[PDB]
Amino acid sequence: SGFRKMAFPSGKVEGCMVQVTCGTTTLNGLWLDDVVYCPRHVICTSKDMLNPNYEDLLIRKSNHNFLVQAGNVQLRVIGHSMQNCVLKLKVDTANPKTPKYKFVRIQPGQTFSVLACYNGSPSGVYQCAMRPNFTIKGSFLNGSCGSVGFNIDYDCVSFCYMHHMELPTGVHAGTDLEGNFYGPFVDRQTAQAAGTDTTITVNVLAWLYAAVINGDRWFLNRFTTTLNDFNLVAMKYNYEPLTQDHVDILGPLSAQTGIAVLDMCASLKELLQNGMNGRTILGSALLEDEFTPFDVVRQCSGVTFQ
Amino acid sequence: SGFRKMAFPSGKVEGCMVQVTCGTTTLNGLWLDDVVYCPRHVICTSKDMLNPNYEDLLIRKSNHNFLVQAGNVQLRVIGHSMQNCVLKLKVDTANPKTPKYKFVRIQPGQTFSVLACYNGSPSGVYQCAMRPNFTIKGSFLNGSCGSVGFNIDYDCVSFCYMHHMELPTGVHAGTDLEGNFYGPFVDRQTAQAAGTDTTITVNVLAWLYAAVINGDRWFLNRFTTTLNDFNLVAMKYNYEPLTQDHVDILGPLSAQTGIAVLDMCASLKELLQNGMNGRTILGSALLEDEFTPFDVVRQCSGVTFQ
């Protein structure tokens, strides 16, 4: 038993991390088959970033202007291209360590693992969630740009995130691997409003199920509630409204614990309205919303990937 | 910026995980050079576990009684032997993916990464702390036994933990890679008393420093305190006593932030006596003790390993 915030094993992703250098700037790139993916702002200087015209900036660059190093192997750049906010550097040799992979645009409220990298070398891996406002609360220092987030689905690495910038408010923003930002953000050094963030209600309920599986009763109540009436309380505490799609997602957790979803909603309702009274759930003094229902079933059944 | 509970990249360790099966039991093994290391209790049945005579049990076993699976290739076991509580299965072929590695016995309060595994397949990775009572609060289901914990020190994998058992109270226990348990525990299915656990005071201070580095300084108070007077307060709240060794270890964080170690203890003293009053520190409503001072410096300077 036990419950932890678990990241996917990163081996398959480590093999794809390269160092990409253009002019003075060095960040991380993703080498799959014979293409390296990296944030296009690698072609910028500190002052360019205030208002870059990326097309003009890239025109002054040629293939040989790009220094791509994969460990100690020098890669040869035979093409360069801009797709939305990502740069696709065509290189002469395919990555032999290329895993089975696809590019995926995830939904707000889904989770993924991040392999934080500096100069193309992996330093850590951690789990996180794409917030409802399309930000992520991560750990990215100078030169972490181009680090990617991913899920593993059996043998297939699903790349969903590439890191581009820290907002003035300290949260993080980035693109899918086709270069479309999550949210309203742009790769330019200006103040940028993230939305009002909300708590991912379906995730919080999945975590309450994880609590019961592991021995925590105490929040279980004698009440129940209705879908319509729970969302009234949700709106007051800035929880995402619950839909029937969400209730269906919680079916298996419902069936294993024997606790109907609206009964768990009633327990959560009392928690929002009266707090936790300085007691904890699965060791936490707050309500946790960074486990999807799939994350909970994986950790409580032991799904492996090889 | 940002701060996360970050695990080491797991690639080098994934390459060493195999599946080891004996009778009905299947758990995980660590294939380094031509030896597979796994818990010796794989040679036990459910009923054997009540009181195993491991010497007699291992005498009755033959090489062919050990089915070692590495991906799709089954390895041929040409020897078996017991070193304390770990079983050493000599195999026909040396692991071509063997990293530079050492076997290390860690101290209570240090941290390490766990590659949680089932049937020899990596399923997840997370950071954890060896508690002062020599247990770990991990996430281990049936067949996770033999999962290992480790640190990376530049290029060398330092294996420090092998998982063996869940205590009846739900916490976890295991050995170093020489088969010596951490703590008073034994590999037999009986009630086993773990110690009184305490909070790792030096880790909490490291995290408070991590908080200041990242912009959370509401808890900074204007006072100081003495080492003797702080430990008096610490003992009342089941914190580990702080030593000068601990103060010296926090030196670099002290110098980077401009907050003397004893001033930070004064902040912590107040935090223990009046709680957090519904504020958070680095997103958390409780005081975190699973980051060592080295963990904080790694994540705040961006040290990589590849």
Numbering used by the authors:
A (entry chain B), B (entry chain A): 1 to 306
From the paper:
Each protomer comprises the chymotrypsin and 3C-like peptidase domains I and II (residues 10–99 and 100–182, respectively), with the active site consisting of a Cys145-His41 catalytic dyad located in the cleft between the two antiparallel-β-barrel domains. In addition to the indispensable role in viral replication, SARS-CoV-2 Mpro also plays an essential role in escaping antiviral defense by cleaving host cell proteins.
Crystal structures of 11 Mpro mutants provided structural insight into their altered functionality. We employed crystallographic structural analysis together with a high fidelity FRET activity assay by our group to assess the functional and structural changes in Mpro mutants. The crystal structures of several variants revealed the changes in side chains orientations of residues in the active site comprising substrate binding pockets, especially S2 and S4, which might lead to altered amino acids preferences. Accordingly, changes in KM values for most of variants were observed, indicating alterations in a mode of substrate binding. We observe the highest level of conformational plasticity around the S2′ and S3′ binding pockets with N142 and S46 being the most flexible residues within the structures we solved. This might explain why with most mutants we see the changes in binding affinities and not the kcat values.
